[PDB]
Amino acid sequence: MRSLFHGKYVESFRRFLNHSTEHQCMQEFMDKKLPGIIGRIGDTKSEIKILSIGGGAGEIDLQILSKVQAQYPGVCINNEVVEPSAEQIAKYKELVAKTSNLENVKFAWHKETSSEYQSRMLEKKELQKWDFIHMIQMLYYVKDIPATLKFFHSLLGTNAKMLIIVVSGSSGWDKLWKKYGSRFPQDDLCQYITSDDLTQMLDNLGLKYECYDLLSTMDISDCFIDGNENGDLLWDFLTETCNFNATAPPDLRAELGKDLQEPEFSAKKEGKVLFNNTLSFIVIEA
C-alpha cells in the first residue's frame, strides 16, 4: 500500500481526466455561472487584479480571464499565479504564448505554495487587495485551511469575490474517504476535504458564501474486471494507491468492489458504472 505520490500519478490522473466529465463540468460553470459571479468585480477600477492559487497548467485560468475581459473590455488585467510546480508553470506559460487575444492581460508566476506566498506577503508592510481570487481543486494540499481561508479572504478588495472548487460532500469521494480513508496510505502532502468540511469551516469563520453543486462523473466500469489496465489505473486513482489491486488487503478490495456500485457511490446506467464526481463551487464575498 504505497501512496500514489509520481509518474504513476500523472498516468492515473490522465486516466481520470479522459474518463470523467470534470473538464466539461468546469467549462459549463464558467459559461453559465462565472459571468454572473464576476459581474461587478471591475466596477470603478482601471485595473482588475486576479489571484490564481494553484493555477496549474492554466486552462481554467484563461477561461476565467476571457469572461472578465468580456465583462470589462479595454480594462487592464493583472493575473498573478501562485504555483509550486515548475512543470505546471512551464505548461501555463506555453499556453499563454499560444493564446492570441491576451494583449490587455499581464501575467506573473510565483513558484511557491499558498502558504509560502502568504508568509512572504506578510513580510511586506501592507497587504495588497485583489478583485478576484480562486483556488480550484487545490485545497487538498493546504495544511492549515482555516488560516488559508481567513488570509485570502482578507486580500479581497471592494466587491471582490473568492472562488473555491473542491469535490462535493454529496459526491462519491466524500463517502469513499469517510469510510476507507484510514485504510488508504497517508501522505503529508494531501488531506481529504469536501464542500461539507469547507462550508463548516466557513460557517465557523463567519464568512458569507454561496455554494453550488454540479454533477460530474467518472466512468469506473473498467474497474470491474481482473487484468483490465485502465480499470487498474482508475483503481489506483480512487485509492490514491500505487497498484491498489496487487497490494491492498483483499478484504479491503472486496469491500470496495461492493460499495463502488452502491447508489451513494455510483449510478448504474447504460451498462456503465459512473462514480459520482459532483463538484462544489463556493463563492465567498469580501
Ligand X SMILES: Nc1ncnc2c1ncn2[C@@H]1O[C@H](CSCC[C@H](N)C(=O)O)[C@@H](O)[C@H]1O
Ligand Y SMILES: NCCc1c[nH]cn1
The answer for residues whose C-beta is within 8 angstroms of residue 154's C-beta and 6 or more apart is: 127
Binding residues for S-adenosyl-L-methionine: 54, 83, 88, 114, 136
Per-residue CA distances from 242 to 4, 10, 152, 184 (Å): 5, 12, 34, 10
Q: How far is the CB of 154 from ligand X (least distance, A)?
A: 17
Buried b or exposed e, range 40-56, using 16+ CB within 10 angstroms? ebbeeeeebbbbbbbbb
Q: How far is the CB of 37 from ligand Y (least distance, A)?
A: 20
Collapsed DSSP state (helix, strand, coil) of residue 105: strand
Q: Which of ligand X, ligand Y, none lies near 22, with the C-beta cut-off 5 to 8 A by kind?
A: ligand Y
Residues forming contacts to ligand X in the complex (CB under 6 A) are 53-57, 59-60, 82-85, 88, 113-115, 136-138, 141-142
Cβ(173)–Cβ(277) below 8 Å:
yes
Q: How far is the CB of 24 from ligand X (least distance, A)?
A: 13
Nearer to ligand X, 71 or 148 (CB): 148
Q: Rounded distance, CA 280 to CA 214, Å? A: 6
Reported in sequence order, the residue ranges of 105-155 that DSSP labels E, i.e. its strands, are 105-110, 130-136
Q: Which of ligand Y, ligand X, none lies near 85, with the C-beta cut-off 5 to 8 A by kind?
A: ligand X
Q: Which of ligand Y, ligand X, none lies near 228, with the C-beta cut-off 5 to 8 A by kind?
A: none
Q: How far is the CB of 161 from ligand Y (least distance, A)?
A: 22
Residues forming contacts to ligand Y in the complex (CB under 6 A) are 22, 137, 140, 167, 173, 277
Nearer to ligand X, 82 or 202 (CB): 82
